[PDB]
Amino acid sequence: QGVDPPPPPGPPSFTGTKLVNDADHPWQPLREGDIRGPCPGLNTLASHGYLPRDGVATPAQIITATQEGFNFENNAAIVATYLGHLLNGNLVTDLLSIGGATPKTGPPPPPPAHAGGLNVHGTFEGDAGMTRADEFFGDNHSFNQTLFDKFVDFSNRYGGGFYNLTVAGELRYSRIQDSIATNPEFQFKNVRFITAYGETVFPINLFVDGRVTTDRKLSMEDAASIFRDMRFPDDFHRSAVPASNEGADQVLAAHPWVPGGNADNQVNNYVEDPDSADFTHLCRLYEFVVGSVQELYPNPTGILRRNLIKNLHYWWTGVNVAFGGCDELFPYGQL
Ligand SMILES: *[C@@H]1O[C@H](CO)[C@@H](O[C@@H]2O[C@H](CO)[C@@H](O[C@@H]3O[C@H](CO[C@H]4O[C@H](CO[C@H]5O[C@H](CO)[C@@H](O)[C@H](O)[C@@H]5O)[C@@H](O)[C@H](O[C@H]5O[C@H](CO)[C@@H](O)[C@H](O)[C@@H]5O)[C@@H]4O)[C@@H](O)[C@H](O[C@H]4O[C@H](CO)[C@@H](O)[C@H](O)[C@@H]4O)[C@@H]3O)[C@H](O)[C@H]2NC(C)=O)[C@H](O)[C@H]1NC(C)=O
Ligand SMILES: *[C@@H]1O[C@H](CO)[C@@H](O[C@@H]2O[C@H](CO)[C@@H](O[C@@H]3O[C@H](CO[C@H]4O[C@H](CO)[C@@H](O)[C@H](O)[C@@H]4O)[C@@H](O)[C@H](O[C@H]4O[C@H](CO)[C@@H](O)[C@H](O)[C@@H]4O)[C@@H]3O)[C@H](O)[C@H]2NC(C)=O)[C@H](O)[C@H]1NC(C)=O
Ligand code: HEM
Ligand SMILES: O=Cc1ccc(CO)o1
Ligand SMILES: O=Cc1ccc(CO)o1
Ligand SMILES: [Mg+2]
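Above: inputs. Below: predicted complex with 5-hydroxymethyl-furfural.
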């Protein structure tokens, strides 16, 4: 009949560096039924047992795993996790797939809600990623070697053979241009416009070993290990401080860009959307997502309504801080 979802964990008691690729968290191969998806962070946490190895977890489990494994900052974890859960998880069982659809998330919600997992395109997952291809080309979740070869190429061209903040700026822009030129359904607005800049610095802030204090840069070997194999580098130590999207601003500044998309199902036809969230209008992302949730859940009652109310509030607790203050919305009233 369902679960009563607890509030998110706070930051970890210990926030320093530590060995996370340790004897208790060994890499293991996929078994039948195990789910993996478009996020190399969650994928690696699952394949080392920081998350359930089957790739289905509670919000609380995801938050604690991102903190334990990578020192992902608490509010960034809350913002990402409840966004993913509201849109793509099962609110009644309190379970989210980190990939595609699975019976492991329990009885399906009422359509148009789906609990289809992080693989679901168009409100969270989106276009112009680093190692995943746009959904238009048929697969938005698998590692793509051609794209990784570009990652390596740009690292050679701008980062001395390593991925650093200069590389991030160049790659992000070039990937947007690729999608403009080749994907007639290319969208780069609302959630995706914001998350895409954060994700380009996570490799620097979170995939670089925490004992590297200066000149933080990621080797192609370490990049392949995480992005392709879902495996921590040998002896991997997490960031020495909670971290998330530091430097994303510089990535945008290197190639200023405006949210929008290819209009009218044509390539090379990018039109700005002035209503979209952007980095000086972050609260629009909050409002947009709450609207999306209402479309998924037009008239909930009982446990589903209760858990929607709680999850919306949990998400707001992170958004309020991360976005610098947003008025909470109550589309379903209060408990
Ligand atoms: C990501 O990774 C990449 C790759 O590792 C990394 O890139 C490095 O980035 C730093 C800067 O962020 C680079 O260092 C800087 O280079 C600047 C450009 O240098 C060129 O021009 C210099 C200026 O020449 C003057 O004099 C000549 C007369 O000789 C004149 O004609 C010119 O017009 C001009 O007025 C020149 O000195 C320099 O050449 C020297 O060094 C090279 C070796 O690479 C050597 O071949 C030359 O013979 C010569 O000795 C070069 O051609 C430069 O302006 C800048 O200088 C500032 O700092 C230094 C020291 O701190 C001061 O002394 C100076 O006054 C300046 O204020 C600095 O050196 C570095 O070269 C990049 N490395 C590579 C491999 O690309 C990114 O930083 C990474 N990103 C992140 C975020 O980490
Ligand atoms: C891994 O991910 C990569 C990258 O996303 C996938 O490769 C892309 O595949 C798409 C689909 O085939 C390619 O898109 C097509 O591009 C053509 C033009 O490309 C040329 O120019 C680029 C540079 O701009 C060169 O790099 C490239 O080599 C080409 O020379 C267009 O002609 C195509 O458009 C036609 O169909 C669409 C859809 O209906 C219409 O909108 C168009 O008007 C037109 O009629 C198309 O857009 C894309 O070029 C590929 N990129 C690269 C780098 O290869 C891989 O498929 C994927 N790997 C696997 C195996 O999954
Ligand atoms: C906290 C919960 C998390 C959720 C719900 C989440 C969700 C997602 C989703 C849906 C994507 C796909 C977006 C796309 O490229 O289309 C993604 C991409 C990504 N995530 Fe996460 N993520 C989380 C945590 C993390 C952490 C902790 C890290 C790093 C340690 C991380 C690093 C990345 C990177 C680098 C990508 C981009 C991959 C690429 O473009 O090739 N994420 N994540
Ligand atoms: O992949 C994770 C992600 C994207 C954007 C944010 C903000 O916490 O986290
Ligand atoms: O600046 C944008 C943004 C989105 C999510 C977060 C917090 O990590 O910051
Ligand atoms: Mg994507």
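The chain has one domain: 40-322.
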